[PDB]
Amino acid sequence: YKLDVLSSVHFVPKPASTSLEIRVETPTISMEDAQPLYMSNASSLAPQEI
Amino acid sequence: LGESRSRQEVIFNEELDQAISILNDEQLILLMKRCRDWNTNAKTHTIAQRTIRCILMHHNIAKLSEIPGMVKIVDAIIPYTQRHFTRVDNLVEQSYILDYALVEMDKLF
Amino acid sequence: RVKTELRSALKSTEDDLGFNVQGLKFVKQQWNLRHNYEFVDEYDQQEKESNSARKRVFGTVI
Amino acid sequence: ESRKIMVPPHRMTPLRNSWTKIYPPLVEHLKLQVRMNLKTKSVELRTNPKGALQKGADFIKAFTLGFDLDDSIALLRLDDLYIETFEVKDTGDHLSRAIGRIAGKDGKTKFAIENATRTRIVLADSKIHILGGFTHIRMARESVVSLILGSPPGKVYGNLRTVASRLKERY
Amino acid sequence: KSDFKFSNLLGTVYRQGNITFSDDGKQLLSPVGNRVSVFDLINNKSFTFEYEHRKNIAAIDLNKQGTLLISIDEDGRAILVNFKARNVLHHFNFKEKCSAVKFSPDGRLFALASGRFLQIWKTPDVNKDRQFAPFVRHRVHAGHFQDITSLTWSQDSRFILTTSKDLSAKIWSVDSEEKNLAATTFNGHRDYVMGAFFSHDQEKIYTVSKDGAVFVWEFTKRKYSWRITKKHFFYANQAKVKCVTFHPATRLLAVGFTSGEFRLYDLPDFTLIQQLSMGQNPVNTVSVNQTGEWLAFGSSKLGQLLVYEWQSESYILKQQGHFDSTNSLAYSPDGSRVVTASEDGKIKVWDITSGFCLATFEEHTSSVTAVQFAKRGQVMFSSSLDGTVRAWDLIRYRNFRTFTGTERIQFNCLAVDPSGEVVCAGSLDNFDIHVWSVQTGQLLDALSGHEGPVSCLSFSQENSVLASASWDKTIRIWSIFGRSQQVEPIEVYSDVLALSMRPDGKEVAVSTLKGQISIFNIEDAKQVGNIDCRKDIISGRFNQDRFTAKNSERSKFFTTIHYSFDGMAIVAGGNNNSICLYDVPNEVLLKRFIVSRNMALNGTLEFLNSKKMTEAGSLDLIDDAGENSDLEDRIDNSLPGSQRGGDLSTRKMRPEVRVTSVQFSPTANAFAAASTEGLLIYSTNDTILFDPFDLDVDVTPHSTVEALREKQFLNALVMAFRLNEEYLINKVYEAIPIKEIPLVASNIPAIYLPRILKFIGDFAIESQHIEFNLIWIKALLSASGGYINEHKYLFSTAMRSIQRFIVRVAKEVVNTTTDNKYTYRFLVSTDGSM
Amino acid sequence: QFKTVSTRTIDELNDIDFNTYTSLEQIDKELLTLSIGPRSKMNTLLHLDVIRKRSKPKEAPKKSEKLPFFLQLSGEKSVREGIAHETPEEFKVTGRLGFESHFTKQLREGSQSKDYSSLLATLINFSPAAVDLEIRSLNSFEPFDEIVWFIDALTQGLKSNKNFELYETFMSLLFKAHGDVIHANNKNQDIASALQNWEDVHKKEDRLDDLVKFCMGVAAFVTTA
């Protein structure tokens, strides 16, 4: 972190990482920020993922 | 279903939907297993939707809930019905270019 | 004539589509209020729903 | 001008042992004079020359009804507090297990509806008394009437979660 | 056209100062840097005041009539604003750093803590005209020995209770006759007294200090002379109190510490009602609603703003902005929200009307360089310095695609297909352009041929030709699709940064480092025309540099340009504090906007005050950081040669003023500029500026309402169009009956067609007459919807504003009534028995 | 610059003299018209459970234990305008005649007078938590009067073509809260007739549907092609 900030963030990135992410299903209302409004009321998993 | 579309509350012939009304738990749960897996197409979905419709209007809803296994099926094929509803609603909203063409053809004279 | 018959067929199929959406989510919801569980506390409720959610694992790139 | 509140012979000994914390707000905060008739098993509240007699009557009537000492002091203070009484009346089948449905195992359903609706409930055999605000009494009473008239435990518990949230919410 | 005014300031919900609520606590007033934002939290909207302090503001108060605001900055330049008219009433310079300002509860006096003097002035009327000196001084009291940290008025506006850095607190009566009731001072704290409040009945006094003690003072006997009756302690060990407030009616003491933790207590018994954390940064502000139900907290380091109801344990809003670190913006394909790509590594989707962030996305592990929408607001692409382009579904909120190269480079700009099969991205260290398919994930191509870092990419929206432009002084046009693999290089005079592309794909406008904006015909690769812009650029002088703003070569060029959606204008911004817009037929400056007048930012002033230049260096390069009250800002952890890294503490210079991205609104006649202060949103409005269109002497509002009363509806509509007066157009529009909407809409002349379409858009977004507005839209589209199709770019922002009304209110209503119809049919058509 | 001046001539339609036009409430009784209020109230009503579930903090706050039970009611003496701080005004059902709420009393009085205008005015007035908390408590048990009074109140409401997105969400909130009891005693005569006349007025709402279908389809065709 401090080498990147010292280098004034011109750096060369980290090589590669095929990681592994678990996402639960939930409303995308609940995946949002705290404000009065919303943007989308879908579910985070597709029909072909359910 | 095709001959039901052909001729003419009831969606099949009435002897067929009373025959689907008088079937028990094991038969209706396997019928909804394969209505679930027919509903994943965009072609074979209408037969599945009308079989789900006649099950819903010829059986008892509390019975359908209390059958063990029919909450992992209806969770599986509610969102398919949702995307088919959005697709057919988009199709019927882009159906009004016929109406726009009619009003242009009427303003022609 | 094409407009009337085509839009009648399309509204006829989305009628039963919408019927089946509301009926199936009624069936699922009355099963839920029959025998889902008992949490009045919101934090234990949200942790219970997070433990009982549907998980799917995806191959991401970092 | 006076009031008489009859203490039943199942809430008599707690009144005597917690009496020394009952009469001080009755005789110096409220400026009444207070006697306890050991003959009629009653509490008499008279006014001295030097609208609070009804407040003292509700104080000792809450204690008489079955609400505890701090709950009765909460009724004596806290002007926006009310208390509603009703019998079940809606026998093995209906009377002997509707009250078991209000209670639950170790009274956990009663504890849950108390905490959810911000009332507190004393459940006799079939006599339900509820101490809370007006809207709070309304919601606790609607849920108690619900689970004596037959509702699923999932339905009444989801309604309890929702009523806790919407009663604490501004807007 | 060119008459833009400063509308809004998205981003940056809080910078520095105190949050205030309204009296009827519907809006909250938040000090952003030198503006003030007001967020209406019930009517979901927001505005920013147009006026501008010259330094960061430090104090806010408006009286409980809601009628006027006073804002003081961090060296005491107060500004009194009319809150309803939104115009500034007076500029008054108090001479030193004012810690707090408060109006009385009865509105008629205000007091403020300037240094170690409590001075009470009396409030000028809002109904009176502006005078040369509207404030009339009531008094100035001096009893503290060090600086006063807080004020508190009593419930009746009769006493005032002030707290100081000196370890006491004092009570002062307002008028001289009650001087004997209020002459005491309250000692006993080990540290700075952070607050001193009354109880509801003004009998108890609570005094809270920095070390963590709250003292209850009562007028008792041990005669009667204000004993201390109980000291309660917070016992937060490392952290200490940063902000205190007290709602006396609900007896609620709210206290925020320097560790993000805030506790709220029920005070005279000192029972912890709640304790929870904003974060890890200190809580700089606590403020409370008039009914005491909402608590607004502000932390100043991350720029975050909570308002939180403590009964129902829930956040009304938990927002956070970005100071100085915002690399890109993109309007949504309807102009409802703006997506912000920011240097701390995240995407933030800000609603424009309600000034808040809806979703945030943190999957980039470095500074996100570009965002761009595609598939008509369904998907959004971003490229960052960590080597990745990645795609975001804005329905399911999932990063579904990640594109890397093979060479481990960092991407600085991107461009997507219209028909979003292909994403494209260019770096500043690789000289190639990377071409990825979006359907599969693979690297489709690496286009080569630039001999300099590819500064900018854009796909033509109509014929889908790629235009890249790079620092080898060359714009280049790639025909990618369909067997061509065709390259056309156009040379230009200097090295290019910010290409932009016309909405019809005919021309491309490049910004160069000379200072010019050249405009080229794509198909016949020859220059159509250029604007020479380096002499209408405001390049200020930095504090550290030893060369004048005239001779500087820092910022006399535009690093971001953008076409208007009719193709006729270019907005442009750069590393300077002017954003300029031009009309490309005439190549002349329409208007230049000064993006900041904050002297706390660096490149604002062109001429620096020669008083501040001493015999050894300027006095603003002297770091007075060890004169600070505590260690966490006496600390210097700024590693030396860092420019544009992260974490503003790690750079040691003032934040320079710069605009990093400009974009026009796709629906309504505005533009957003990603400055360092936030997302500046400049918009016109038609309520002001009488600008007629070929009226004659017989065209008059009186004539229009006579034609309306005589019910020549088409003549009244075209008279109101020739007036171009918004109230008259609205009056005639609502007075035309439903029976003859299509006759009027068919007989509207073709020059008044974009006016009625853009009126119907900006009216129907918020108007309730949904079936009336849809009848008018249906009549206009049916009667004259061929003229629109053959004049696309005229009605390209008036038709996008109309289908911002159909899909965003009308389709939501239609969805609700559809679900009600189907739930009815189920609930009555089926079998519920047992 | 601070007020607005009248453009009315001196010598020696007050809205048109002050250059304003306060937009009239509904243009025609046969025209649908939304509420005069924020557009987001429909969405807040329809999804206020999941919005508040979003808005909860990630872990429970640290309270005390010697906290008073009636803390919400134990204020002092800026007054609270919620549904919880509501007092009754001035022989056992769910709400006696001394402990009737304002909503239930106005609903009963409108069922007497067959005019629910004051009921609907109170419904359009109060806040989403109050709306959910009033609809969720509606006596769905023995004779079903309060449900059917609410349903034909919404019928009288959306006959008037005003506030109709709010009357639509009130019907959605009814079907969501206790549409299971309506499905339970389906074929009950009073509740079936109340739903019947609600559908009789509500079936004339497809004017909005095919109007927005025309506008969407033709606007898309005209813009793209």
Curated annotation (Swiss-Prot), chain A:
Coiled coil residues, start to end: none
Top-level taxon of origin: Eukaryota
Protein's cellular compartments: Nucleus, Nucleolus
Complex and partners: Component of a heterotrimeric complex containing IMP3, IMP4 and MPP10. Interacts with snoRNA U3. Component of the ribosomal small subunit (SSU) processome composed of at least 40 protein subunits and snoRNA U3. Interacts with the SSU processome subunits EMG1, IMP3, IMP4, KRR1, NOC4/UTP19, NOP1, RPS4A, RPS4B, RPS6A, RPS6B, RPS7A, RPS7B, RPS9A, RPS9B, RPS14A, RPS14B, UTP1-UTP18, UTP20-UTP22 and UTP25.
Family: Belongs to the MPP10 family.
Free-text function comment from the UniProt entry: Involved in nucleolar processing of pre-18S ribosomal RNA. Required for the early cleavages at sites A0, A1 and A2 during 18S ribosomal pre-RNA processing.
Protein name: U3 small nucleolar RNA-associated protein MPP10
Name of the encoding gene: MPP10
From Swiss-Prot, chain B:
Compartment(s) of residence: Nucleus, Nucleolus
Miscellaneous comment as given in the Swiss-Prot or TrEMBL entry: Present with 8070 molecules/cell in log phase SD medium.
Subunit organization: Interacts with snoRNA U3. Interacts with MPP10. Component of the ribosomal small subunit (SSU) processome composed of at least 40 protein subunits and snoRNA U3.
Its job: Involved in nucleolar processing of pre-18S ribosomal RNA.
Protein name, as recorded: U3 small nucleolar RNA-associated protein 13
Taxonomic classification: Eukaryota, Fungi, Dikarya, Ascomycota, Saccharomycotina
From Swiss-Prot, chain C:
Localization per record: Nucleus, Nucleolus
Role according to the record: Involved in nucleolar processing of pre-18S ribosomal RNA.
UniProt miscellaneous comment: Present with 9620 molecules/cell in log phase SD medium.
Quaternary structure and partners: Interacts with snoRNA U3. Interacts with MPP10. Component of the ribosomal small subunit (SSU) processome composed of at least 40 protein subunits and snoRNA U3.
Family membership: Belongs to the WD repeat WDR3/UTP12 family.
Protein name, entry field: U3 small nucleolar RNA-associated protein 12
Biological source species: Saccharomyces cerevisiae (strain ATCC 204508 / S288c) (Baker's yeast)
Curated annotation (Swiss-Prot), chain E:
Region of interest called Disordered, as start-end residue ranges on this chain: 631-652
Compartment annotation: Nucleus, Nucleolus
Source species, domain of life: Eukaryota
InterPro entries: Apc4-like_WD40_dom, G-protein_beta_WD-40_rep, PWP2, Quinoprotein_ADH-like_sf, SSU_processome_Utp12, WD40/YVTN_repeat-like_dom_sf, WD40_repeat_CS, WD40_repeat_dom_sf
UniProt-listed GO biological process terms: endonucleolytic cleavage in 5'-ETS of tricistronic rRNA transcript (SSU-rRNA, 5.8S rRNA, LSU-rRNA); endonucleolytic cleavage in ITS1 to separate SSU-rRNA from 5.8S rRNA and LSU-rRNA from tricistronic rRNA transcript (SSU-rRNA, 5.8S rRNA, LSU-rRNA); endonucleolytic cleavage to generate mature 5'-end of SSU-rRNA from (SSU-rRNA, 5.8S rRNA, LSU-rRNA); establishment of cell polarity; maturation of SSU-rRNA; maturation of SSU-rRNA from tricistronic rRNA transcript (SSU-rRNA, 5.8S rRNA, LSU-rRNA); ribosomal small subunit assembly; septum digestion after cytokinesis
One Gene Ontology molecular-function label: mRNA binding
Keywords: Nucleus, Phosphoprotein, Repeat, Ribonucleoprotein, Ribosome biogenesis, rRNA processing, WD repeat
WD repeat positions: 11-51, 52-92, 93-131, 143-182, 188-222, 236-275, 278-318, 321-360, 363-402, 406-448, 449-488, 491-530, 553-592, 654-692
Phosphoserine: modified positions: 629, 642
Gene Ontology cellular-component annotations: 90S preribosome; cytoplasm; nucleolus; nucleoplasm; Pwp2p-containing subcomplex of 90S preribosome; small-subunit processome
Protein family (similarity comment): Belongs to the WD repeat PWP2 family.
General remark: Present with 16700 molecules/cell in log phase SD medium.
Listed name of the protein: Periodic tryptophan protein 2
